[PDB]
Structure 1
Amino acid sequence: SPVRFVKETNRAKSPTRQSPGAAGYDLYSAYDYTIPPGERQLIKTDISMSMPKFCYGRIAPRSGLSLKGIDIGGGVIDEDYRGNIGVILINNGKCTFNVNTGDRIAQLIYQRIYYPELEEVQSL
């Protein structure tokens, strides 16, 4: 029951998985960007996916980048999202951060979730 994906352009890199115990799948920039210190930038992957059921894709940080002051904004890829998967990279470092086409920028993690019906009660 694979996750089907589409490359919007030929600049997209098929998300990679390196080991059996990796949390997710590597995501790559499809374009060149420059992020000044204290600013953030939406990074296009040019990948779209028909996501698994009862799951969401978490855009989660890479460890090396996190140590360089690069943090992740937003990051909730809904199961019903069929659009371009974007990575919001936040530069909380002191220097400019460059993003080149084909650079690893994040990992996508398919996180199992629950969809309960909610009902209001008088007390818990």
Structure 2
Amino acid sequence: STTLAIVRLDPGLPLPSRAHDGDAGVDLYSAEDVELAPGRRALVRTGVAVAVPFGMVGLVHPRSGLATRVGLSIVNSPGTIDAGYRGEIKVALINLDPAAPIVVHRGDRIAQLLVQRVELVELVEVSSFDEAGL
């Protein structure tokens, strides 16, 4: 029900979509062709920008299946997209396989985007946890 406004910065890519109604995330595609040699990383453009609602957070997870099979991961997983970030979502892909290079083609699914509420907690410093109402 909650709406996620999304802009296809690169109109040549398919609009991300939820494969199944209950799926936690939507796959993001790569806007560029990139080849990751064993152990190497790259900041890859997804060609999309989103407006995560205040009080929520966008999270970029690596995909399972073949992606995991070949050792594709994300350096800063879970990628954190803040409510105020309106820029292009980029994925810090990293090939965790010791010998087999990973070839990323433009249009390839490289990650999945989830949206969850986040507790924008107010940090209150205390000398110790022996505080009433902790």
TM-score, normalising length from structure 2? 0.86
Q: Does 1:104 align with 2:109?
A: yes
- Please tell me the root mean square deviation across aligned C-alpha atoms, in Å: 1.2
List runs of 5+ in structure 1 lacking aligned partners: none
Does the CA-based 8 Å contact 1:8-1:47 persist in structure 2? yes
The alpha carbon displacement at 1:116 in A equals 1.2
Partner of 2:73: 71
Q: Secondary structure at the match of 2:117?
A: strand
The alpha carbon displacement at 1:35 in A equals 0.7
Sequence identity percentage: 41
Q: Secondary structure at the match of 2:118?
A: strand
Choose 62-71 or 29-38, whichever is displaced more: 62-71
Partner of 1:122: 127
The alpha carbon displacement at 1:78 in A equals 1.0
List runs of 5+ in structure 2 lacking aligned partners: 130-134
Deviation per residue, 1:4-47 (Å, 9 max, x gap): 11122223331111111211111001111111111001110110
Partner of 1:4: 5
TM-score, normalising length from structure 1? 0.93
Partner of 2:33: 32
Could you list the runs of 4 or more consecutive aligned residues of structure 1 that deviate by over 4 angstroms after TM superposition? Answer: none
User: Matched residue pairs, number?
Assistant: 124
Deviation per residue, 1:71-108 (Å, 9 max, x gap): 11221111111001011111011211111111111110
Distance 1:83 1:16 in 2: 19
